[PDB]
Fold this protein.
Amino acid sequence: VNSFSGYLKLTDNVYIKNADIVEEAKKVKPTVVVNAANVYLKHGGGVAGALNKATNNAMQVESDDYIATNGPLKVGGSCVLSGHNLAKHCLHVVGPNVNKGEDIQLLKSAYENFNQHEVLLAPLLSAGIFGADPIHSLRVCVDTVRTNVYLAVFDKNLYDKLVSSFLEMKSE
Ligand SMILES: COP(=O)(O)OP(=O)(O)OC[C@H]1O[C@@H](n2cnc3c(N)ncnc32)[C@H](O)[C@@H]1O
């Protein structure tokens, strides 16, 4: 398990790869895969839709059961559910939806949930549907997370931009 390979090491504990998070999960067999969730665990598009599709909708049914028992998550919060065929566990983390005016500072709270797990395969939280600048999401991750985070960025042009931007900011 946790057989990560081909990552670029950004810091002592943050790694990045140009890869689809679902294909990485199948390759790596991680203990924890992170979902970029919303408070009602309605896994539609982006990472949540991709993860859910790869579980043949089991992650959505499990999430429906969770919500019916526990109610919606809070923004910046998380829950640990099954990783189904992709991982031992899925950590569902809710970044702020910047497009709806939710506090961008809650992206720090969101990434703080990573610190409860020794190693994670994760996406850039809030950087898609939720409208945060991906460069900002990466900076918050690097600054907030102390545990080992392996970031999967599927789009090559974004990957290239993130790496070059990270280098410029790291040295200045
Ligand atoms: C809930 O709204 P969020 O903004 O928190 O989350 P989301 O829309 O999923 O996007 C979060 C970031 O992961 C990127 N991304 C989308 N699909 C994949 C995938 N299969 N593998 C890897 N990365 C992906 C997306 O392009 C964005 O950079």
